[PDB]
Amino acid sequence: KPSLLAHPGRLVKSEETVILQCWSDVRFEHFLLHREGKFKDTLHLIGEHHDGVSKANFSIGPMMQDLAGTYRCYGSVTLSAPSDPLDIVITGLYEKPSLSAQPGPTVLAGESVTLSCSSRSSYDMYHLSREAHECRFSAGPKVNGTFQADFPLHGGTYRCFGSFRDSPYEWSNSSDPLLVSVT
Amino acid sequence: IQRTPKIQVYSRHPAENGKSNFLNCYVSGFHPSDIEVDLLKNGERIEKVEHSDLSFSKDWSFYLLYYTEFTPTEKDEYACRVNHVTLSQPKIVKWDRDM
Amino acid sequence: HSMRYFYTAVSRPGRGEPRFIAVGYVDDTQFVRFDSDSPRGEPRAPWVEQEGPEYWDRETQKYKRQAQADRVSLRNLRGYYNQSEAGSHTLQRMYGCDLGPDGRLLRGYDQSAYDGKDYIALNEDLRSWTAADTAAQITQRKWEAAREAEQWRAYLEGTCVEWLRRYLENGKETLQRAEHPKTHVTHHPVSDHEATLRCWALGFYPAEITLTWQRDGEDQTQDTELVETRPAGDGTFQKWAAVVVPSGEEQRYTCHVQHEGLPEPLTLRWEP
Amino acid sequence: ILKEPVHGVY
Incomplete structure (x- = not known):
């Protein structure tokens, strides 16, 4: 092939x-x-x-x-x-989400890092790129009115995008690049 | 939603035998927008007929004006043939020079 | 005064891409058209034929892009309702701005229908939508993530008003000058004891008219035959109002014509 | 003037 x-x-x-x-x-x-x-x-x-x-x-x-x-x-x-x-x-069709990391963007090797993609917009789904193959459905609305998903995750720059279930190939504007430093 | 068209046949100006004029067929109130409208002279399709661009009213129903230049006579009869999905057969409305 | 745009997109399943037709009005005077079936933005009034060739290229471009967005929209809409591929479907949108006596914004509006049925509308605040049904809630949710409400509020409050006031200046001799109606009454015998009185209003612009039949000065709202106001073709409008009266009582009936282009109402009477 | 077709896909 x-x-x-x-x-x-x-x-x-x-x-x-x-x-x-x-x-x-x-x-x-x-x-x-x-x-x-x-x-x-x-x-x-x-x-x-x-x-x-x-x-x-x-x-x-x-x-x-x-x-x-x-x-x-x-x-x-x-x-x-x-x-x-x-x-x-x-x-780039919809407003961009916010990408966070608990505990923090810079960790030491071995600390588990999680990424949180969130938005006030009701994305059904969220996509994690770095290249992308991570999709986690959203949960919300949160009291804040936020729709959010968590990507349990050496090092790189991460983006996350929202999308709706009806159009799986149509994603939001990219989130601002988040750099995970594994030192 | 399906809406049968309203049909009005008339002239642009009061009919005056021997004077140039325009013969109009106003179809409105219909949905969907696919409509066949012919203007007929003694039963025969007039071949050069124009129409306005598709528009619609507040209730979402469409309207179209078909029209052609023509010189009314006493010897000639005119009509409008409308065909639409809500119609069993094509509807013919005859031109009344006072309606 | 107002400026309104009317989109009609109709799927042609297996007969090509969806037909997109658009028309722009200023009050009751069309001025622009577009048909995807070389698709060009085209003037339909002489006071826009005086915009330059860069106005019109920009116009054409937006049109052809609205036709490509509508083509995707109708492909989504069918998906929302689990509708098949074979069936033709309709997407309509009407939007625009009204102005008050100050020549500035009174209200903006933007409403859509799917197969003739209300679907989504922009609320007056020009910040939110109302969704007619659960399919239209997906569209609302996407438009909100799209941040569309603002795009529209910048249109309706800014460029819609600025271009209406420019159109109205460019067509002041046609658009800001009401044409009053030319009226007459006709008469026809009806069976043995009755007769039709028909009150005619012709050559009037704008299209808003009120014809009323009065018996001894009493409104004959019932037993009056009122025809839909109809375009004449020359930019003016026509309307007639008939009433069936007894033979020999014709002299008691007066027709009354109300139109904003008239400093006194018109009263008419068929005399034999 | 026409409204700019931005991201108005339904």
Whole structure:
């Protein structure tokens, strides 16, 4: 199966562009990029050949909500197996949440650190990136009117995003970058 | 929600046989917005007919004005044929020069 | 005076992308249109034909983007109601600003309907929404996270008012000048003992009119046939009001015409 | 003038 990679990453800010790179070891003379989601599509590209690597660079234009979803790429010699799914999200559609750390952003190695993403906006879900693969559903409203989730977590800069269950690929503006220093 | 259109056939100015005028069909109060409106001269579709851009009232129901240039005579009859999902058959309203 | 915009987006499942139609009015005078089915913002009144080509490019751009947002909105709306793919659905939005005698803001408004039914409206404070149902609560929640209420309050209180006052200056000879109606009464026999009296109001702008039949000076609110005010096509409006009277009692009936473009009401009487 | 389509998706 071919490989599908987002450059610089699968988190695309609204009105910005991302490139999906489809590349294989097999010599395919054409490449297919198919999105499944709110609005589906199939994109056709000729296919560059260099050192036994067959490659195409699909450019995903000014990011809009209809371009977000799960992309797969295929190669043909005139269809190959699907490339594993690549979820491409849009971000920046909603107000940004606050990211905190208990006990504190700077800890010593071995201390458990937890991150709290919170907002007055009723996000159903919250996403933890650093690259993202952590989703924790929200809890709230809190007496404050806050909707919050906790990500039990060496070191890095963390962001967190809110989203709603109906549109899993549409996230809030990024939270301010929180740097976890594990000394 | 489905609303049957109200149909009014009329002229832009008081009909005067032999004088240029415009024949209007005002359809309003209807929902959904898909509507077929023809203007008929002695039963025959007039081919060059224009209409206003889709708008709607406060109750969310739509209205459209179809119109065509025409010279009323005593010998010619005019009508408006409206077709809409709420209609069993197309509805024809004849032009009364005093309505 | 007021400025209102009317959006109509209609899904064409399997017949292409949703059709988006928009119209802008200043009082009862349309001035702009847009149809996604080369989509261009287009003037419909001569006093906006005097904005420059950068006004109109900006306008077109927003239009085509509203058509792309509506296309996603209708795709969400169907999801909220668990509606199928095959069915056509309608999304309407009306918004704009009224002005008071001071030429400044009286009220702003922004209301939406889905398949003809109320859906979400901006509250008068221009800070909150009312959600018609549980589907519209998801939209409210997203618009609140979007911080939309402010975008709209900056529109309705600022640019909506500034451009209405500029439109009204640019069309002062048409928009700030009421045209009073031209009235006459017609007469038709009805069966053997009755007769129709029809009171006509033509060539009037704006469209707000009151026609009333009086018998000896008594209001005949019942037994009066009142037709919907209708566009004439030349920018003016038409309305008639009929009453069925006994043959030979026609002289007791007076028609009364009230329109803001009149320094005295019009009283009419069919005489034989 | 038209209202700017910002994030008004329903």
